[PDB]
Amino acid sequence: ASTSQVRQNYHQDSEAAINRQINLELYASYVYLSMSYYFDRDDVALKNFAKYFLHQSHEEREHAEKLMKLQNQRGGRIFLQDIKKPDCDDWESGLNAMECALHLEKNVNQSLLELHKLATDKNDPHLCDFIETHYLNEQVKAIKELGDHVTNLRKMGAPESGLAEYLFDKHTLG
Amino acid sequence: ASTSQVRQNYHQDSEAAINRQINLELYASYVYLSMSYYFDRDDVALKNFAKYFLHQSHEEREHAEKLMKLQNQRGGRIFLQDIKKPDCDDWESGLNAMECALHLEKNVNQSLLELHKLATDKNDPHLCDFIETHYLNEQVKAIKELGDHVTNLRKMGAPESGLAEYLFDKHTLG
Amino acid sequence: ASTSQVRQNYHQDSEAAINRQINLELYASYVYLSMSYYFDRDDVALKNFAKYFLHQSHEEREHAEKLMKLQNQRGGRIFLQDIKKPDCDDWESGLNAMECALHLEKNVNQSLLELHKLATDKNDPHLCDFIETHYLNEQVKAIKELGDHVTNLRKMGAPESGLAEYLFDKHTLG
Amino acid sequence: ASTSQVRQNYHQDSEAAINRQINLELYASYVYLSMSYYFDRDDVALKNFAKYFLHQSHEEREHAEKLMKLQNQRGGRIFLQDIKKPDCDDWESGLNAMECALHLEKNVNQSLLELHKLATDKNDPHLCDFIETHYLNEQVKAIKELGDHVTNLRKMGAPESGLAEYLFDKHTLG
Amino acid sequence: ASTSQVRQNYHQDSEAAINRQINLELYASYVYLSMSYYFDRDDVALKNFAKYFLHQSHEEREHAEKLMKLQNQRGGRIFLQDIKKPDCDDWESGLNAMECALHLEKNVNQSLLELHKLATDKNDPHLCDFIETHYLNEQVKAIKELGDHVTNLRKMGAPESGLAEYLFDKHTLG
Amino acid sequence: ASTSQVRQNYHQDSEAAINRQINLELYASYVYLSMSYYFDRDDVALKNFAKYFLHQSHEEREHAEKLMKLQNQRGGRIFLQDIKKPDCDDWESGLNAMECALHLEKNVNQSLLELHKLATDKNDPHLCDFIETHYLNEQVKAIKELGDHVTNLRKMGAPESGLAEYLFDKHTLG
Ligand SMILES: [Cl-]
Ligand SMILES: [Cl-]
Ligand SMILES: [Cl-]
Ligand SMILES: [Cl-]
Ligand SMILES: [Cl-]
Ligand SMILES: [Cl-]
Ligand SMILES: [Cl-]
Ligand SMILES: [Cl-]
Ligand SMILES: [Cl-]
Ligand SMILES: [Cl-]
Ligand SMILES: [Cl-]
Ligand SMILES: [Cl-]
Ligand SMILES: [Cl-]
Ligand SMILES: [Cl-]
Ligand SMILES: [Cl-]
Ligand SMILES: [Cl-]
Ligand SMILES: [Cl-]
Ligand SMILES: [Cl-]
Ligand SMILES: [Cl-]
Ligand SMILES: [Cl-]
Ligand SMILES: [Cl-]
Ligand SMILES: [Cl-]
Ligand SMILES: [Cl-]
Ligand SMILES: [Cl-]
Ligand SMILES: [Cl-]
Ligand SMILES: [Cl-]
Ligand SMILES: [Cl-]
Ligand SMILES: [Cl-]
Ligand SMILES: [Mg+2]
Ligand SMILES: [Mg+2]
Ligand SMILES: [Mg+2]
Ligand SMILES: [Mg+2]
Ligand SMILES: [Mg+2]
Ligand SMILES: [Mg+2]
Ligand SMILES: [Mg+2]
Ligand SMILES: [Mg+2]
Ligand SMILES: [Mg+2]
Ligand SMILES: [Mg+2]
Ligand SMILES: [Mg+2]
Ligand SMILES: [Mg+2]
Ligand SMILES: [Mg+2]
Ligand SMILES: [Mg+2]
Ligand SMILES: [Mg+2]
Ligand SMILES: [Mg+2]
Ligand SMILES: [Mg+2]
Ligand SMILES: [Mg+2]
Ligand SMILES: [Mg+2]
Ligand SMILES: [Mg+2]
Ligand SMILES: [Mg+2]
Ligand SMILES: [Mg+2]
Ligand SMILES: [Mg+2]
Ligand SMILES: [Mg+2]
Ligand SMILES: [Mg+2]
Ligand SMILES: [Mg+2]
Ligand SMILES: [Mg+2]
Ligand SMILES: [Mg+2]
Ligand SMILES: [Mg+2]
Ligand SMILES: [Mg+2]
Ligand SMILES: [Mg+2]
Ligand SMILES: [Mg+2]
């Protein structure tokens, strides 16, 4: 009950915000897992879409683990919640999955910006630096990459052109 | 809606049982993740317990992925549910975590034996072979290893002896 | 006209400030280019001064390119202006060029500090981290190096001693 | 004020023409820089167009530096002017950028042919050889390459076909 | 007396705070030096405790040197004070030394957080980034490691169990 | 309180003299540290003077550590005092720093000769051999090197000639 021997300048509200961010990162890992195996279906059959989203799934589990490490490093206590099944919808196409991923990463970035605003308000420069170093530029690069992918698929004629998704699978994700 | 072009000798009940087993494997990955970071806390501080359970967590995510591949290979459709937060309790000690892991793996094995009985009842030898090849002996080895670990910790004087858990961490999990 | 699909927490004023900083970095590349070839003249003939300033010129073009990448990563639109010819004056000596470079880098640093104050005012932690990571310490090291060079040239007897500039060229810039 | 000790058979008009050519080469570097980052935008997203034009930008800066070296080698004095922002227009498409580049390189070649006619009129065989050796065939190869690129993009169905620009990006510029 | 040629956006109060932090880092190096040689005594004789604290001593001297470099880089003037002999007390045991080290590192971290609050108040983003990059996470990792060590020693039965300190020396610090 | 089990032929007065010599070696490390960073200032800017004195600082910390080892080897008890800030004065020039270092090393040598006279008076041949083996010739070589450096700087025209200190920095300390 009494304080962690390591805890210093770590607000209860920051501790709770980090637990919510852990859940969000595990949720993002689950969304990309579901998206991956959609492209593995025999009636979709785009293997590089499947590999691309599995890699993204594995990266989100690493992002969750790094926040669980941070919680312990600062003397906070991890509190886990259910990982909700993916919302987005039935995946429909390579383009629609890429658009769901863009929205997911823009929602994760908004959560991280709220987390950074709280750490700023509580004058926690270690937590500010943590978020900036490990999360904020990774989100900007992820969002830019997904926007690039959505643009190419749209220009190529997706989702109507099954040829467009096939050739994007080989040339961009291959 | 209409049948997958690949589907052959794959009962609707088998398809549903495989989706339930996917959820159970993701749940087991989550239980071991939680257990891992407990041992990373500054007031527990057993780093080889933490690494041992993280590795086990990563192995369960691989077990889930292999069942999602199987579902697609057979022309079934993956249906995901929420991943429940870990039940077990507050982890308390290295011994108590090992005992929770033993119970978890004995519950996963019972699920797989029920799955095998269903595949047997539906005369699905491919699914029987899948379960036997990739799951049943992995469960028997996991259960035997966790029983060995629980025995050693008990003989060494855990959970009262903090020396016992420390030296087990170095010599068995190190 | 309508918003970039990637744009998030990126103020119009930040977007414009980044375009002004791009112009300033290209201007700094031009100042160092001019300084370089002054030392290549047959009546100046200090080859290590020439190489030192050419390298500095190439570094400023890289600094401009990284800001053009950032503008696109954040969903801003690059707006280019004329690159003004160098102001400073006729270069006169190794010491006078080093003093012009010190003033240039102290003016670029003041621009970057104003840019950081704007990003702080608009609560853009990604842009704050970008400036701190890629620009602020590079400016402090550049300013310290140029101050060191100016000090040595002054102590050695420059600009009157042509021997001083010759031996500095060989021993410090060689 | 008085003559460079190295100057021999180098007409004042040649000296001035070389300074104008320096400005034109820096302007061409700026045009290709702008074109490069257009293709880096999230709503254009053709990375090999972007790399192709950045390389061309870097080559034009080298062409400018070689003329600044020549000016000093002959005992002329470098005189720099503002580098104008790119004219061409909004870039619109891969085809339109390639067409702007073709017009740019045909304007640079006309400048170099005028420069060669002046050196011929002033009986400066060193300057004639300089232009022929380092510039004239580089312009003919650049113009031929850009014409080839424009032809392919037109035959492939650009600019209407976003598929055409995508596949040209992978197969020709990749 | 008059201003350093390099000084820009570096408040007199920041300059003084950096000199106080230099003294604190040298004091921390001295505390760990004293602790090291305690464990080298023939009536204590724990060689891995001795090596662990000597390494920590050498790391604190590096932390002091990096702040003396920063002071010069920013155009401040180093002002040195006596390095006080270690306070803590007679070292008594491996556990008591580890507890003194935990308190030392939590006092150094509080000094660095006060330093960061001053740099924030004076809008010095270069100094904020310096502290965050080189100091704040190094303090969080140091504090977490020392808390882990204190926990293990307590669980193992230290300081009463001389066996506990012996086996910790071999297995954790060895 | 009672005697160390290892103590043999080690006089209380020798024990106290060794503690005073430890303080003197730490003081010499501090003097050279201060001298080092003086030459790192932007208005002094002699980098090989700075490296030379930092190396000397690191060597004095090693000399202190070896005496703390000796104290324990002989069964004496280390007693630490404050490390006084450097006396010498404001450093002024490369020559003045070298002259302060010569005086420092001649004061350390006089302390060691007094220490050797005490060990001789107490018939401690182990301590006599320790001082002769590890300290006395290191002091004679240090004093000879600093005298050589002072001579060269004086002959070269230091401290008036800033050229002299610059060229000594490159050729002797480089
Ligand atoms: Cl509190
Ligand atoms: Cl919580
Ligand atoms: Cl929940
Ligand atoms: Cl980046
Ligand atoms: Cl059927
Ligand atoms: Cl189902
Ligand atoms: Cl559900
Ligand atoms: Cl087996
Ligand atoms: Cl053991
Ligand atoms: Cl062992
Ligand atoms: Cl808005
Ligand atoms: Cl603008
Ligand atoms: Cl303009
Ligand atoms: Cl640095
Ligand atoms: Cl003439
Ligand atoms: Cl001209
Ligand atoms: Cl102009
Ligand atoms: Cl050819
Ligand atoms: Cl291909
Ligand atoms: Cl001021
Ligand atoms: Cl001060
Ligand atoms: Cl003092
Ligand atoms: Cl870390
Ligand atoms: Cl006695
Ligand atoms: Cl004493
Ligand atoms: Cl004292
Ligand atoms: Cl010798
Ligand atoms: Cl020389
Ligand atoms: Mg949430
Ligand atoms: Mg990712
Ligand atoms: Mg993430
Ligand atoms: Mg639900
Ligand atoms: Mg970064
Ligand atoms: Mg279930
Ligand atoms: Mg396992
Ligand atoms: Mg499993
Ligand atoms: Mg529940
Ligand atoms: Mg088998
Ligand atoms: Mg401007
Ligand atoms: Mg530079
Ligand atoms: Mg720059
Ligand atoms: Mg003008
Ligand atoms: Mg900040
Ligand atoms: Mg940095
Ligand atoms: Mg022109
Ligand atoms: Mg070219
Ligand atoms: Mg050209
Ligand atoms: Mg204009
Ligand atoms: Mg000819
Ligand atoms: Mg040729
Ligand atoms: Mg203090
Ligand atoms: Mg440390
Ligand atoms: Mg420190
Ligand atoms: Mg005192
Ligand atoms: Mg860091
Ligand atoms: Mg003394
Ligand atoms: Mg020495
Ligand atoms: Mg010494
Ligand atoms: Mg005093
Ligand atoms: Mg000897």
What H or E segment, with its residue span, contains residue B129?
helix B125-131
Report the chain C residue with the minimal C-alpha distance to residue F162: C155
Flag if C125 and A136 touch (Cβ within 8 Å): yes
- Domain count within chain D: 1
- Answer whether E167 sits within 8 Å of B166, measured CB to CB: yes
Strand, helix or coil for residue D156? helix
Amino acid identity at A162: G
Give the one of D6, D40, D86 whose C-beta lies nearest to C69's C-beta. Answer: D40
Angstrom CA distances, E144 to B112, C164, F169, stand at 41, 54, 44
Spell out which chain B residues touch chain A, with contact meaning CB-CB distance below 8 angstroms.
Answer: 4-6, 26, 30, 33-34, 37-38, 40-43, 54, 61, 65, 68-69, 71-72, 75, 77-78, 80-86
What the block records as the tokens of B79 is 């249906």
CB contact under 8 A, A82 and B81: no
How far does the CA of residue C132 sit from the closest CA of chain E (Å)?
Answer: 6
Tell me which chain C residues have a C-beta less than 8 angstroms from the C-beta of D37: 68-69, 71-72, 78
- Give the residue among F13, F30, F27 at the shortest CA–CA distance from F114: F13
CATH of the domain at F75: 1.20.1260.10
| Touch criterion met for F and C (3+ Cβ pairs within 8 Å) | yes
Do residues D169 and D94 make contact, with C-beta atoms less than 8 angstroms apart?
yes
Residue D10: give the domain boundaries.
3-174
Residues F67, F18 contacting (CB under 8 angstroms): yes
How many beta carbons lie within 10 A of that of residue E16, not counting itself? Answer: 13
The torsion region of residue C157 among left (phi > 0), alpha (psi -120 to 50) and beta comes to left
Find the angle CA(F114)-CA(F115)-CA(F117) to the nearest 5 degrees.
Answer: 60
Residue in chain C closest to A143 (alpha carbons) equals C6
Contact between residue C116 and residue C128 where contact means Cβ atoms under 8 Å apart = yes
CA distance E55 to C151: 37
Q: Helix, strand or coil for residue B48?
A: helix
Query: Distance between CA atoms of D54 and D95, rounded to whole angstroms?
Result: 17
**Residue E63 labelled as part of a binding site:** yes
Chain E nearest C-alpha distance from A86 (Å): 35
DSSP state of D78: -
Q: Which two tokens stand for residue F20?
A: 């005073």
Tell whether residue A139 is among the known ligand binding residues: yes
Nearest C-alpha of chain E: how many angstroms from C157?
A: 18
Q: Do A73 and E113 touch (CB under 8 A)?
A: no
Is residue D94 within 8 A of residue D102, CB to CB? The reply is no
Contacts 24+ apart (CB under 8 A), E62-68: E63/E25, E63/E28, E63/E134, E63/E135, E63/E138, E64/E22, E64/E25, E64/E26, E64/E29, E65/F33, E65/F54, E66/E134, E67/E18, E67/E21, E67/E22, E67/E25, E68/E22, E68/F33, E68/F37, E68/F40
Cβ neighbours of D34 in C, within 8 Å:
78, 80
Signed CA dihedral, C151, C153, C154, C157: sign only = positive
The whole-angstrom distance between A140's CA and the closest CA on chain C is 7
Which DSSP string corresponds to D23-36? HHHHHHHHHHHHHH
DSSP state of E132: I
Token pair for residue A62?
A: 């690493």
The number of the ligand nearest the C-alpha atom of E4 reads 20
E105 is in an annotated binding site: yes
The phi, psi pair for E83, rounded to 5°, reads -95, 110
- Nearest residue on chain D to C41, alpha-carbon basis: D72
Distance (Å) of CA C156 to CA C151, C166, F43, F44? 9, 11, 13, 12
Query: Which of E5, E129, E130 is opposite residue C102, by nearest beta carbon?
Result: E5
Write the DSSP assignment of chain F as a string of letters. -PPPTT--S--HHHHHHHHHHHHHHHHHHHHHHHHHHHHTSTTT--HHHHHHHHHHHHHHHHHHHHHHHHHHHTT-------BPPP-S----SHHHHHHHHHHHHHHHHHHHHHHHHHHHHTT-HHHHHHHIIIIIHHHHHHHHHHHHHHHHHHHHTTTT-HHHHHHHHHHT--
Centre of ligand 54 to C-alpha F54, Å, is 27
Residues with CB under 5 A from ligand 7 (ion): B 81-82
Q: Cite the DSSP H helix spans in chain D.
A: 12-39, 47-73, 94-121, 125-131, 137-156, 162-171
Amino acid identity of E64? A
Look up residue D37 and give its two tokens: 């980052």
Residue D49: other Cβ atoms inside 10 A: 26
Amino acid symbol at C147? G
Phi, psi (degrees; rounded to nearest 5) at C147: -65, -40
Q: Is C160 exposed, middle or buried (0-12, 13-18, 19+ CB in 10 A)?
A: exposed
Backbone CA torsion sign across D92, D98, D99, D103: positive
User: The tokens of C155 are what?
Assistant: 């102590």
In degrees, to the nearest 5, what angle opens at C-alpha B97 toward C-alphas B91 and B100? 105
